[PDB]
């Protein structure tokens, strides 16, 4: 099977009512104290408004939750408060809901985010590290609370670059970790989807997001955004393999019995496993160094259980440029 090397035990060593989101109840409070202001955006389950707290004029994001299960929501809304305080995971100010109709809101922390198609080419070196630091701390929380985010994308991680603030949102998707637990691979969002979603391996583990957290390096250094642009799941796959190698895919797969949808014979082809390297160019050389193609090569790994962890990755040398400006 597979397990996470880390953080295999959060929650099994914390009180069920930790993990056990479907249980969880949350306390939901007045919608009606919250001015939706501008909607944001619109995922599958909710849509995302700016909003301002007109009892305290707190300007928040309001994510109201879609007509999903309840359990989805439990499981945000649990994970989020599991999260609560966690270093740059959006923070969850409340849970509300429209008084009258029992919608379920989430309210965010406001995060002025800049947009990352302009962000990620404009990002320094020490931009990339930093913000990649920066999720990492989110991501090596939320694992640390046996939290898998599963959706690691750009659109997930708010970047208030004015500010140098993070923030990993839309938890969503996000699922307590428990070994051996068999995950719907219907996660993450195709170009960040780790091989494992890919090939359907449910096994998986917080990994995942450092697989996603991964592609986000790797197209913020070589600003190839989305670094691995699938058109569909299985050619995410094949632009993994392509960039991976595919005896190293195979090789992943024979170490986790997995066997590839078959559809994959007439597609995944044979690639050589590429250099990190190839992907640097002219515009993006100052943006990778050893140490960032190191990093990506420890998180852009077929296995996700050789992934650096997020704590691995955010003690890589990459950032140590981020650890010593964070001190000193
Ligand atoms: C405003 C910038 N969009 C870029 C994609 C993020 C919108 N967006 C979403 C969420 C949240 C946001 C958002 C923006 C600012 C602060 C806090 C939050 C959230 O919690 C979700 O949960 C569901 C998906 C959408
Ligand atoms: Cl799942």
């Known amino acids: 099977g597979s397990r996470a090397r880390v953080y295999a035990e959060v929650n099994s060593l914390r009180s069920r009512?930790?993990?056990?989101?479907?249980?969880?109840?949350?306390s939901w409070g007045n919608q009606d104290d919250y001015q939706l202001v501008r909607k944001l955006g619109r995922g599958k389950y909710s849509e995302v408004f700016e909003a301002i707290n007109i009892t305290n004029n707190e300007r928040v994001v309001v994510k109201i939750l879609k007509p999903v299960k309840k359990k989805k929501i439990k499981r945000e809304v649990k994970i989020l408060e599991n999260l609560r305080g966690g270093t740059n995971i959006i923070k969850l100010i409340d849970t509300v809901k429209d008084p009258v109709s029992k919608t379920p809101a989430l309210v965010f922390?406001?995060?002025?985010?800049?947009?990352?198609?302009?962000?990620?080419?404009?990002?320094?070196?020490?931009?990339?590290?930093?913000?990649?630091?920066?999720?990492?701390k989110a991501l090596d929380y939320c694992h640390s609370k046996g939290i898998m985010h599963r959706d690691v994308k750009?659109?997930?991680?708010?970047?208030?670059?004015?500010?140098?603030?993070?923030?990993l949102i839309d938890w969503g998707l996000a699922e307590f970790y428990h070994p051996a637990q068999e995950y719907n691979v219907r996660v993450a969002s195709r170009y960040f989807?780790?091989?494992?979603?890919?090939?359907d391996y449910q096994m998986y583990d917080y990994s995942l997001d450092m697989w996603s957290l991964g592609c986000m390096l790797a197209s913020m250094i070589f600003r190839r955004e989305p670094f691995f642009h699938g058109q569909d799941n299985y050619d995410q796959l094949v632009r993994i393999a392509k960039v991976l190698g595919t005896e190293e895919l195979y090789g992943y797969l024979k170490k986790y019995h997995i066997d590839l949808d078959p559809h994959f014979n007439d597609i995944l082809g044979?690639?050589?496993?590429?250099?990190?390297?190839?992907?640097?160019?002219?515009?993006?050389?100052?943006?990778?160094?050893?140490?960032?193609?190191?990093?990506?090569?420890?998180?852009?790994?077929?296995?996700?259980?050789?992934?650096?962890?997020?704590?691995?990755?955010?003690?890589?040398?990459?950032?140590?440029?981020?650890?010593?400006?964070?001190?000193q």
């Open 17 to 26: 009512e930790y993990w056990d989101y479907e249980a969880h109840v949350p």
């Open 270 to 327: 044979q690639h050589s496993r590429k250099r990190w390297e190839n992907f640097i160019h002219s515009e993006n050389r100052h943006l990778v160094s050893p140490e960032a193609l190191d990093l990506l090569d420890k998180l852009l790994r077929y296995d996700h259980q050789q992934r650096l962890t997020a704590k691995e990755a955010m003690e890589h040398p990459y950032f140590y440029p981020v650890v010593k400006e964070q001190s």
């Open 193 to 199: 989807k780790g091989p494992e979603l890919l090939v």
């Open 154 to 167: 750009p659109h997930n991680v708010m970047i208030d670059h004015q500010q140098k603030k993070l923030r």
């Open 109 to 136: 922390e406001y995060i002025n985010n800049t947009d990352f198609k302009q962000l990620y080419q404009i990002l320094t070196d020490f931009d990339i590290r930093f913000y990649m630091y920066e999720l990492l």
